[PDB]
Design a binder for this molecule. Structure first.
Ligand code: BCL
Ligand code: BCL
Ligand SMILES: CC[C@H]1c2cc3[nH]c4c(c3C)C(=O)[C@H](C(=O)OC)c4c3nc(cc4[nH]c(cc(n2)[C@@H]1C)c(C(C)=O)c4C)[C@@H](C)[C@@H]3CCC(=O)OC/C=C(\C)CCC[C@H](C)CCC[C@H](C)CCCC(C)C
Ligand SMILES: CC[C@H]1c2cc3[nH]c4c(c3C)C(=O)[C@H](C(=O)OC)c4c3nc(cc4[nH]c(cc(n2)[C@@H]1C)c(C(C)=O)c4C)[C@@H](C)[C@@H]3CCC(=O)OC/C=C(\C)CCC[C@H](C)CCC[C@H](C)CCCC(C)C
Ligand SMILES: COC1=C(OC)C(=O)C(C/C=C(\C)CC/C=C(\C)CC/C=C(\C)CC/C=C(\C)CC/C=C(\C)CC/C=C(\C)CC/C=C(\C)CC/C=C(\C)CC/C=C(\C)CCC=C(C)C)=C(C)C1=O
Ligand SMILES: CCCCCCCCCCCCCCCCCC(=O)OC[C@H](COP(=O)([O-])OCC[N+](C)(C)C)OC(=O)CCCCCCCCCCCCCCCCC
Ligand SMILES: CCCCCCCCCCCCCCCCCC(=O)OC[C@H](COP(=O)([O-])OCC[N+](C)(C)C)OC(=O)CCCCCCCCCCCCCCCCC
Ligand SMILES: COC(C)(C)C/C=C/C(C)=C/C=C/C(C)=C/C=C/C(C)=C/C=C/C=C(C)/C=C/C=C(\C)CC/C=C(\C)CCC=C(C)C
Ligand SMILES: COC(C)(C)C/C=C/C(C)=C/C=C/C(C)=C/C=C/C(C)=C/C=C/C=C(C)/C=C/C=C(\C)CC/C=C(\C)CCC=C(C)C
Ligand SMILES: COC(C)(C)C/C=C/C(C)=C/C=C/C(C)=C/C=C/C(C)=C/C=C/C=C(C)/C=C/C=C(\C)CC/C=C(\C)CCC=C(C)C
Ligand SMILES: COC(C)(C)C/C=C/C(C)=C/C=C/C(C)=C/C=C/C(C)=C/C=C\C=C(C)\C=C\C=C(/C)CC/C=C(\C)CCC=C(C)C
Ligand SMILES: [Fe+2]
Lengths: 68, 281, 260, 305, 44, 54, 44, 54, 54, 44, 46, 44, 64, 46
């Protein structure tokens, strides 16, 4: 909130300051979206790795429901 | 479309995302950003179930079934007619559940009450994800998840249980069953007690919490109180779901044989393993 | 009786399942009608009865006979706010938030709301007050856990608001309900137990900031609290969650505010 | 923040001996100790417990049932404590063989002891139900607990008593023993085709999952509005505060409808009762009216073929 | 105090703080990407 | 058709219009799905057969 | 004069006129669609 | 038959009309589905046989 | 058709526009998925058989 | 005369004009897309 | 098409832009996953 | 001039101009990406 | 004129200002890369046009 | 590591940031092309 000291970012004209402020808005929102998606991807990957570490391949169960 | 007291609570704010873009009500429902997401996902999932019924050929609701990809597709994708629809419906269902929980968070914030309810819902979401996402990924195929049919996911339950003999010999399963039974008992007792206190014998005054504690100390010699019983109900339900999720996460993953063999460890303890007589030996 | 069918495939099992469907529909009707005893009939956003009142009709009136000669309650019945609400509709159409006009925490709107309850103390089964200060409660003492008495109270802005002087306790349940906090000015307020995190050094209150501790309502008699005062105090403290967010000195909240 | 799961401070004072109306205080015992371990979660006080005529009858019958099964377990172990500990879960008090049918002519080692223990359990449970009803009546309350217990008793009777009579054999009942009754349920399933395709079994499971769901919802709601003193639900019924209003508005804005501080308990008691009610009906039908539930489902549109 | 560009100590400290914040955000995203790739197809 | 306008004195126009729109959309979806279910009138499939796509 | 919604007679008449105009437009489009389908592939 | 108007002194028209609309649509759908179930009166299949679309 | 503007005297444009956007996107996704389901009009596979990606 | 959202007649007319302009633009794009698809692969 | 600017007299740009960003990322992820599902266009396996 | 958010005509016009500029930049990048993919592996 | 963007705090205002700077430079770099990619693609398409598949020529250089 | 801020007393941020952006994009393209060259990790062909 407190004003910055370098004050050379203030030399940009308001219109281009805009053309990046809104960028910042919309796409901060989808940065949150990307964080969520990659978190789920990492969770799936962690369970995949724990599945590899275990001896599933040697002995595995048949398909519960018909047609696989 | 307002309750007699609802007016003073409809105020702005208390929203995690969206400012006041979706801060409005539709009838009684509160929409919000996550409400928009929930509605979209729910509608898409239901229509895709109807379309999978069209592909299957049957219009009987109990026969409609959306099977997951066979084991030969591994963890990859599948054709929409033979596996893809299940995966799209599963992504829709997961999104709808998560958005429902977050919408509940927003409503809790707008009302100023604690966040126990979305937290409790997160346990059911995690159990569902264990059955659909964590266990199949751990085990190596989407064909280990259950189909989306009314009577065909019972076939999944039966086949998965009988792969390991009598599934009753699962300890993380025994604990979960005992928790579910205790929860049903507690719910019946609590509902009946509060109803009998608030609706006493005909013509008599409403009873007080002192009467409730007296009744349960007369009956069994211990009364847990009101705050106690609500705490206990929440804990019992959450613990039942947690242990059921555990029981299904260790099945087929670190235990592969019949489940009674696990119970064979106690019998084989060194200081009674060889003594004759009894059922075992 | 195994395998015998009256018609088609209909037999004893089908009879049972269909009779159960009928019973279940009746039971859902009955339960919802019972749940329609408070808050109905529906109102418009200005106060007039609505056009849409529900597929389920209102139930027959029932009466509760309150204890200790407090009277009787009839539900459903004519229910009114019995207080003025300080809100202004933001939009003409139905289904939009009503913004507060003055100070929401004092006006008692939003999460800081309260209901005009009975202005009488809560009574146990015997006829005594259910909540008493511990020093006036004979035989009561802290049994376990960190004793809060004498610990400084800290607000959500990390500034000390006062010191704990006493504990209010529920006499039947034997569980602590309220802390009594004495401010710099010497006056004593109440704080519910559910809103304080009794730490090693201090009692921490994340709902209210220090400057707002003076704004909590007070009680008429020092040896009792009524339901209405309970409601006002609890509503004030809880609405502090939303309406004291700017003054709240939280690291993650500050980071989110800087982000936005 | 404090989530109200556990008390952060305990206070204790004079023990509460309870209310006194139409109740004989001589039967009420003395107040037991204060348990701090339970005091963290709920009330720390134990007792006083009412020991009436039905209390004594129930205690005697239950003690005899438990001890009868224990003595049979000892005999089955060769009276070896080590074997008794090694095979505690694997013992069984089996019902009489199908050869004898419903007859009481079973030898004491192959069916008579089961009948004696069953009689003791029958007496104990029915005396306990009478005790629950009488305790509610003494304080002048409603008999709701009696009727919920009656639902549970109905399922229990169908499992142990009525269904063997209809089937015509004592061998249909449940053996006393941990893994013995687990195996009994599994075999009951296997004999009658999938019990899954029993519609009333499905309804029973629906109401058990519903009991868990509803108790989680209600516990979370009351803990979330306990900061307004919502746990005093009888007071909220008497004089609706802001706790009840906030809870009702949360559920109304969530799913379009709500309950009151009293009616949610009607929902709770019915969602718990219907479990045993529908389970009893489904078990009663199995074997008596249907012998293969999978074929019944196939004929009633439930199974694919 | 070389002052080859004209920035003072406070300006340099603030600029470096913001730049390092951006660098650590970029590095965190890169790390999660590498973890995902390694889980999908390890190169060791 | 004489005095049907008085129905708007009984039903709020907003709720009625919302319900009618929802109902019409769902009904049209249901009828299109039913047609797609049958081997004839499955315009995609019979077009594939007419033009010898498969 | 029931007025469960608060509309007067003139408002109700105007609303019904506009609503019926919309209904007849929708019905006309539906009728031409059904005619086209019946010509393309009759179901009787 | 003349005094039947007095039913409106018993029932609010709003609830009655909503229930009537729901009931009529439900009944119409039920009967149409029942007709579609039988091999005869399954107008879709009757016509597909008449014009030899199979 | 001229007086249709009066619908905006009934509905707040914000809610109507949000609902319209959600509905249109949902419908478009539904129709695209339906086309992708059928072996014909599954443009991916129609091209993959055209260029022999199998 | 009737009023539920507070808009006047002029505001409603202007809003409807702009909304219909957008609707017709969307419909035109949809029509050209359907023509292109039908030319590429007709469904009748 | 000229008067479309008036939409900004209806919607606050902040909410609209946040929703737009979230929607665009979600749609892109959905389409990429759909392509990855099919054996063809699964560029990894191709 | 409904002004549900409080923007004037000039502010709305400027905001729309900048937003459309961003939209057209995004669309141009998408178009070149689709052209590259179609050249690499056409889907028609 | 819109002056609502000015409400964002300053330190963030430039925490995005140079986001803008540095990555604008490489957005120019990306434009160059994709222009080259599209040029190569155009030449590949023109190569697909001509009757080259019928008759091709051997390697001018040998041993690879 | 604390005093690294003093680098901004040496270099104008504009030039440094432009060079950094160009360098990062160039390096990313180089590594992606190297991966695409090898028959393995050529995710398209895999
Ligand atoms: C939990 C362990 C197993 C499983 C084991 C069983 C068994 C065993 C049975 C069911 C039964 C049912 N299960 Mg199942 N079930 C699982 C996962 C699910 C999921 C999910 C998203 O994961 C859902 C939606 C369901 C849904 C259902 C219902 C069709 C049915 C009654 C449940 C009920 O009333 O619950 C309590 C909830 C409520 C009372 C609230 C209202 C819920 C409504 C009715 C749910 C309708 C869903 C609708 C069809 C979806 C569109 N199951 C997993 C794989 N389920 C029972 C049945 O009769 O099946 C025919 C049954 O016997
Ligand atoms: C392979 C095994 C079979 C199967 C076989 C059976 C059989 C057989 C039965 C059930 C029954 C039930 N099963 Mg099944 N079940 C299977 C799969 C499932 C699955 C699942 C996910 O797969 C689930 C969730 C369930 C769930 C359920 C419950 C809903 C239901 C029991 C209600 C209850 O509380 O009973 C237990 C409650 C009681 C016994 C009440 C007891 C009351 C008395 C008064 C207590 C006296 C106590 C005594 C005196 C001791 C006190 C001592 C001290 C004083 C403390 N089953 C499969 C298909 N299940 C029952 C039912 O109703 O089915 C319709 C039943 O009989
Ligand atoms: C503590 C765990 C227990 C619990 C808790 C719990 N569930 C909850 C809550 C809580 C505290 C809520 O707040 C939330 C709620 O709002 O309830 C009204 C919810 C809820 N619990 C629900 C049901 C439910 N809970 C269950 C279980 C339990 N819930 C646990 C025992 C079960 C089962 C199978 O045991 C069911 C069926 C819903 C009533 C509700 C969440 C509603 C919801 O998610 O709505 C959004 C989605 C839709 C409206 C539809 C989506 C359709 C899908 C896209 C298709 C799915 C097909 C399906 C897989 C087919 C299977 C056959
Ligand atoms: C709505 C159905 C659910 C239910 C309800 C229920 N059970 C009940 C009640 C109710 C409403 C009682 O009032 C009563 C009670 O007093 O509970 C504290 C009872 C009761 N439910 C009991 C147990 C019980 N309930 C179970 C289940 C259920 N109870 C259902 C899920 C189970 C299971 C799943 O197996 C058990 C083991 C007891 C705690 C109690 C009945 C006590 C009794 O009958 O005692 C007589 C027997 C003895 C004294 C033997 C003692 C042996 C040794 C001396 C020890
Ligand atoms: C003490 O307190 C308590 C009360 O209160 C006083 C309560 O009432 C309750 C609440 C409990 C009840 C009311 C009892 C009945 C509840 C059950 C028996 C549990 C079972 C509940 C259901 C199966 C109902 C499920 C209904 C659902 C999920 C409705 C779904 C709605 C949608 C999908 C659409 C929602 C609309 C949206 C998102 C906005 C519209 C979208 C636009 C884009 C516009 C509890 C627990 C309680 O503890
Ligand atoms: C970006 C960089 C390049 C992509 C990296 C991807 C990292 C994934 C982590 C490791 C996965 C892996 O091992 O791949 C090999 C497996 C193939 O396994 P397999 O079948 O061949 O079995 C053997 C596996 N190995 C050989 C490694 C031992 O592929 C998958 O795991 C596919 C599952 C991941 C799908 C992710 C979907 C995301 C949707 C959003 C989440 C929301 C949940 C909705 C429910 C989903 C239901 C469908
Ligand atoms: C999502 C689909 C929900 C399906 C449940 C049907 C209930 C809808 C009835 C309703 O209240 O609509 C509100 C609207 C608005 O009117 P209303 O219902 O709000 O009127 C006041 C409310 N009452 C009368 C109960 C006090 O109802 C109608 O406009 C239509 C009236 C009857 C016509 C019903 C047709 C739908 C039938 C499909 C059922 C399958
Ligand atoms: C095979 O499938 C089977 C056969 C099984 C299913 C078949 C089922 C049967 C039951 C189908 C039933 C169909 C019937 C029940 C549906 C009929 C629907 C019609 C009657 C609905 C009418 C819709 C008319 C709409 C489109 C018109 C709306 C008018 C608006 C556009 C105008 C706006 C009005 C505003 C301007 C009024 C405001 C005026 C001022 C004063 C404010
Ligand atoms: C299996 O087969 C299936 C089921 C898939 C087929 C089913 C088909 C049926 C069921 C689907 C039905 C589809 C029909 C009903 C959908 C038609 C939708 C029409 C209405 C599209 C409308 C589009 C409207 C466009 C997007 C308008 C946009 C608005 C513009 C951006 C301008 C708005 C500017 C506002 C008005 C500013 C004005 C402010 C004031 C101050 C002047
Ligand atoms: C299975 O098949 C599926 C279902 C996957 C296919 C389904 C397809 C359909 C359902 C998807 C629909 C896609 C369409 C609807 C999405 C189209 C989106 C368009 C609108 C993209 C728009 C992009 C806008 C760009 C990103 C604009 C960015 C803004 C710039 C950064 C500049 C902003 C600067 C502001 C205006 C500053 C101005 C401030 C004032 C003071 C001047
Ligand atoms: C070391 O400690 C000692 C050994 C001294 C004591 C410890 C003993 C332990 C080992 C006892 C173990 C007991 C077991 C573990 C209890 C298990 C009980 C099982 C789990 C109950 C399961 C099912 C119960 C069925 C449903 C019973 C139903 C009861 C029927 C409804 C009653 C029917 C009564 C009829 C048959 C009576 C017919 C005979 C008369 C004369 C007419
Ligand atoms: Fe309760």
């Amino acid at each position: 909130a407190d004003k910055t000291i370098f004050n050379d970012h203030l030399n940009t004209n308001p219109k281009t300051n805009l053309r990046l402020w809104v960028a910042f808005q919309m796409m901060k929102g989808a940065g949150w979206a990307g964080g969520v998606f990659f978190g789920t991807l990492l969770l799936i990957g962690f369970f995949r790795v724990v599945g590899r570490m275990l001896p599933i391949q040697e002995n595995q169960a048949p398909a519960p429901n018909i047609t696989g | 479309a307002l309750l007699s007291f609802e007016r003073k609570y409809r105020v702005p704010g208390g929203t995690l995302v969206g400012g006041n873009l979706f801060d409005f009500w539709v009838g009684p429902f509160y929409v919000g950003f996550f409400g928009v997401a929930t509605f979209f996902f729910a509608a898409l999932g239901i229509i895709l179930i109807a379309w999978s019924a069209v592909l299957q050929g049957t219009w009987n609701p109990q026969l409609i079934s959306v099977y997951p990809p066979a084991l030969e597709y591994g963890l990859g994708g599948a054709p929409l007619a033979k596996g893809g629809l299940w995966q799209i419906i599963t992504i829709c269902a997961t999104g709808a559940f998560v958005s429902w929980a977050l919408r509940e968070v927003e409503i809790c914030r707008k009302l100023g009450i604690g966040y126990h309810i979305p937290f409790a819902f997160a346990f059911a979401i995690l159990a569902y994800l264990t059955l659909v996402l964590f266990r199949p990924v751990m085990m190596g195929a989407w064909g280990y998840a259950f189909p989306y049919g009314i009577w065909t996911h019972l076939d999944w339950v039966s086949n998965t249980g009988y792969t390991y003999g009598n599934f009753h010999y699962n300890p993380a399963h025994m604990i979960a069953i005992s928790f579910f039974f205790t929860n049903a008992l507690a719910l019946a007792l609590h509902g009946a007690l509060v109803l009998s206190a608030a609706n006493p014998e005909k013509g008599k005054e409403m009873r007080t919490p002192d009467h409730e504690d007296t009744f349960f100390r007369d009956l069994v010699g211990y009364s847990i109180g009101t705050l106690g019983i609500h705490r206990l109900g929440l804990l019992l339900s959450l613990s039942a779901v947690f242990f059921s999720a555990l029981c299904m996460i260790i099945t087929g993953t670190i235990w592969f044989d019949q489940w009674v063999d696990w119970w064979q460890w106690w019998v084989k303890l060194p200081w009674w393993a060889n003594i004759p007589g009894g059922i075992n030996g | 009786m195994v395998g015998v069918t009256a018609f088609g495939n209909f037999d004893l099992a089908s009879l049972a399942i269909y009779s159960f469907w009928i019973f279940l529909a009746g039971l859902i009707y009955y339960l919802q009608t019972e749940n329609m005893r408070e808050g109905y009939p529906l109102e418009n956003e200005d106060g007039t009865p609505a056009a849409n009142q529900g597929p389920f009709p209102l139930p027959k009136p029932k009466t509760f006979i309150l204890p200790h000669g407090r009277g009787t309650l009839t539900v459903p019945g004519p229910e009114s706010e019995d207080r003025p609400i300080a809100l202004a509709r933001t939009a003409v159409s139905e289904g939009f938030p009503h913004a507060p006009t003055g100070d929401p925490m004092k006006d008692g709107v939003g999460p800081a709301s309260w209901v005009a309850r009975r202005d009488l103390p809560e009574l146990d089964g015997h006829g005594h007050n259910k909540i008493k200060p511990m020093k006036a409660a004979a035989g009561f003492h802290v049994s376990a856990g960190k004793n809060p008495i004498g610990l400084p109270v800290r607000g959500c802005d990390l500034e000390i608001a006062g010191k704990v002087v006493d504990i209010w306790v529920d006499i039947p349940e034997q569980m602590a309900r309220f802390l009594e906090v004495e401010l710099k000015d010497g006056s004593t307020r109440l704080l519910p137990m559910q809103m304080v995190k009794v730490q090693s050094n201090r009692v921490h209150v994340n709902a209210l900031s220090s400057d707002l501790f003076a704004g909590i309502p007070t009680i008429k008699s020092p040896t009792e609290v009524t339901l209405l005062e309970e409601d006002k105090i609890c509503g004030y403290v809880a609405g502090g969650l939303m309406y004291a967010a700017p003054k709240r000195k939280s690291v993650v909240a500050a980071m989110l505010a800087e982000y936005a | 923040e404090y989530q109200n799961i556990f008390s952060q401070v305990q206070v204790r004072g004079p023990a509460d001996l309870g209310m006194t109306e139409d109740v004989n205080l001589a039967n009420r015992s003395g107040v037991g100790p204060f348990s701090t371990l339970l005091g963290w979660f709920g009330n720390a006080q134990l007792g006083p417990i009412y020991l009436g005529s039905l209390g004594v009858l129930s205690l005697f019958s239950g003690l005899m049932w438990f001890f009868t099964i224990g003595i049979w377990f000892w005999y089955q172990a060769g009276w070896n404590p080590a074997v008794f500990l090694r095979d505690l879960f694997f013992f069984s008090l089996e019902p009489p063989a199908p050869e004898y049918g419903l007859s009481f002519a079973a030898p004491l080692k192959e069916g008579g002891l089961w009948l004696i223990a069953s009689f003791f359990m029958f007496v104990a449970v029915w005396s306990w139900w009478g005790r629950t009803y009488l305790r509610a009546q003494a304080l002048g309350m409603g008999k709701h607990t009696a009727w919920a217990f009656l639902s549970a008793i109905w399922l229990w009777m169908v499992l142990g008593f009525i269904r063997p009579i209809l089937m015509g054999s004592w061998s249909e009942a449940v053996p006393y023993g941990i893994f013995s009754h687990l195996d009994w349920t599994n075999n009951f399933s296997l004999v009658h085709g999938n019990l899954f395709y029993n519609p009333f079994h499905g309804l029973s499971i629906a109401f058990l999952y519903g009991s868990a769901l509803l108790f989680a919802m209600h516990g979370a709601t009351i803990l979330a509005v306990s900061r307004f003193g919502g746990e005093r639900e009888l007071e909220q019924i008497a004089d609706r505060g802001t706790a009840a209003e906030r809870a009702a508005l949360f559920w109304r804005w969530t799913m379009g409808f709500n309950a009151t501080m009293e009616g949610i308990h009607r929902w709770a008691i019915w969602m718990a009762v219907l479990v045993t009610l529908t389970g009893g009906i489904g078990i009663l039908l199995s074997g008596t009216v249907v012998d293969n539930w999978y074929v019944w489902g196939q004929n009633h549109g439930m199974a694919p073929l | 105090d070389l002052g080859y560009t004209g920035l003072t100590d406070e300006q340099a400290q603030e600029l470096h703080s913001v730049y390092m914040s951006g660098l650590w955000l970029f590095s965190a995203v890169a790390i999660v990407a590498h973890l995902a790739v390694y889980i999908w197809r390890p190169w060791f | 058709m004489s005095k049907f306008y008085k129905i708007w004195m009984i039903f709020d126009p907003r709720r009625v219009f919302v319900a009618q729109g929802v109902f019409l959309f769902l009904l049209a979806v249901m009828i299109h799905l039913i047609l797609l279910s049958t081997p004839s009138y499955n315009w995609l499939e019979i077009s594939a057969a007419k033009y010898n796509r498969v």
